[PDB]
């Protein structure tokens, strides 16, 4: 790293600084003065102080990018958001008066919830006991299950079963199926849940 350990990460939160001094707690007040002395890193290009910034949609864009082509990864994400937006408007005008109250049209609320319906609770880790590897169920951490949800959605879409379908139409179709708890990505979570509950007899091999 070209930054020294002295350099601290910057805080882009715009509503934090505005906080009145009257609300500042004694511990928080101290921190603010301390940061003045500290050196701060330059904010990276990815994150700004905009009101539309979403850390989950920026991380999902970085996990699809290939070779630093972020203009294409971001383009696919926005096309997908617009495809989810246009498909729900088409399902809202053709719905009954009482069916329109249960139709979500915000593509973000769909993206965050669909990824939450794919997060597994427990995973399988190979442990070496008696010169053999056993896939014992282990509790996945919060980050791990948030990462697996994104990786599986991108692997399913990348999978070469759909012969000639553009990513925005594929990613949009999988996000709407996981929103209703359907599709292979959800099924892939169940298959990992069915193998962790069948091999619960080997839940003592692990130590941590």
């Amino acid at each position: 790293s070209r930054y020294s350990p002295e350099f601290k990460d910057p805080l882009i939160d715009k509503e934090y600084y505005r906080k009145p001094v009257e609300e500042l707690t004694e511990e928080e007040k101290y921190v603010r003065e301390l940061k003045k002395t500290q050196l701060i890193k330059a904010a990276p290009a990815g994150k700004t102080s905009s009101v539309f910034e979403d850390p989950v949609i920026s991380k999902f864009t970085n996990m699809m990018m290939i070779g630093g082509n972020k203009v294409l990864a971001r383009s696919l994400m926005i096309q997908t958001l617009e495809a989810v937006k246009r498909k729900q408007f088409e399902k809202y005008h053709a719905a009954s008066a009482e069916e329109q109250a249960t139709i979500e049209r915000n593509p973000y609320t769909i993206f965050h919830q669909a990824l939450k319906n794919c997060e597994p609770m427990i995973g399988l880790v190979p442990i070496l006991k008696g010169g053999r590897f056993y896939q014992v169920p282990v509790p996945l951490p919060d980050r791990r299950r948030r990462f697996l949800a994104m990786k599986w959605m991108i692997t399913e879409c990348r999978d070469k079963k759909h012969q000639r379908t553009l990513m925005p139409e594929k990613l949009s179709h999988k996000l709407l199926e996981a929103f209703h708890n359907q599709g292979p990505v959800i099924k892939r979570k169940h298959d990992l849940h069915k193998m962790a509950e069948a091999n619960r007899a080997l839940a003592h091999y692990r130590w941590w």
Partner: protein, 316 residues
């Protein structure tokens, strides 16, 4: 034995003091100066002209200094003709270090009987110069533990002077951005000019005090110059943070680098020039947000035996 440590006595150093004084009057005759008012800075300037050396090491270049700054301080003879050591702690090996611990421990006993920012404790390397004695790390810590113990107690006025000697000073540079001088153009509009740098991109930004939020990069509207939204987001960031969008007119000229290197360089220039039209408190928030710091991340060089900067050729 052929290798002997170069020992310099007082008589040898006394003859070196006379050659420098005479050489100091000769060097002033060469340059045509007055010998009396010929300081050491002029000697360093005259020796760098008469003996020009481009050696990167400044300790390997010609130097004509006073013998007290060249020759190191040496432990003087520690006994008379009879052979009795002057000091009573000679046989300890560290008579200077132990005489100081004996004095500090003696002042801590008197206290019982009758009963800060900008300063740092003398470093180990600086404490071996006051005593002319080699000191281990552990011995230095022991000495610091007694001084701190001295401070906690209700030390008298004299003791404060004693401790102060071992407390060196550190000049801390206030982490405050340098405001640019507001200028005025022919029409009378106020503005501030600053410069930025990102990778290989260099940018100059002029920020007018009053404007309608119009930005011209190299004479072209920013949206035309920057098609990618991300680049435009970087331009907005400084102004959005200080909640003053659509209030200034910017005229910048960026050269070098690429698409994303040019925006970063402009962001930093605008941000620095926008600190003159905001309060001191807002400038500190910009600093804590990473808007006034120059990103030092630049491309790393490739090494002769590797595929890349850090990537290695495949191990067979």
């Amino acid at each position: 034995p052929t290798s002997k440590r170069e020992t310099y006595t007082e008589d040898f150093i006394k003859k070196q003091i006379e050659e420098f004084n005479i050489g100091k009057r000769h060097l002033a005759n060469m340059m045509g100066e007055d010998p009396e008012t010929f300081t050491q800075e002029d000697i360093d300037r005259a020796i760098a002209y008469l003996f020009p050396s481009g050696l990167f090491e400044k300790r390997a270049r010609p130097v004509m200094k006073h013998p007290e700054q060249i020759f190191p301080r040496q432990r003087a003879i520690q006994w008379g003709e009879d052979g009795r050591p002057f000091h009573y702690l000679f046989y300890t090996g560290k008579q200077s270090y132990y005489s100081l611990m004996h004095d500090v421990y003696g002042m801590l006993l008197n206290l019982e009987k009758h009963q800060v920012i900008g300063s740092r404790w003398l470093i180990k390397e600086e404490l071996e110069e006051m005593l002319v004695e080699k000191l281990s790390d552990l011995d230095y810590m022991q000495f610091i533990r007694l001084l701190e113990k001295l401070l906690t107690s209700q030390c008298g006025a004299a003791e404060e002077e004693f401790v102060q000697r071992f407390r060196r000073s550190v000049t801390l540079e206030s982490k405050k951005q340098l405001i640019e001088p507001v200028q005025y153009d022919e029409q009378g509009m106020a503005f501030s000019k600053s410069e930025g740098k990102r990778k290989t991109a260099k940018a100059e930004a002029i920020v007018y005090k009053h404007g309608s939020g119009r930005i011209k990069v190299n004479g072209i509207d920013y949206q035309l110059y920057f098609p990618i939204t991300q680049d435009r987001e970087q331009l907005m960031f400084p102004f959005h943070f200080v909640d003053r969008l659509g209030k200034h007119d910017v005229t910048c000229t960026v050269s070098g680098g690429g698409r994303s290197a040019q925006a970063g360089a402009i962001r930093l220039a605008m941000a620095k020039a926008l600190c003159s039209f905001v309060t001191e408190d807002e400038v500190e928030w910009m600093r804590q947000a990473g808007l006034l710091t120059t990103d030092p991340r630049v491309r790393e060089r490739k090494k002769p035996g590797q595929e890349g900067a850090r990537r290695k050729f495949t191990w067979k």
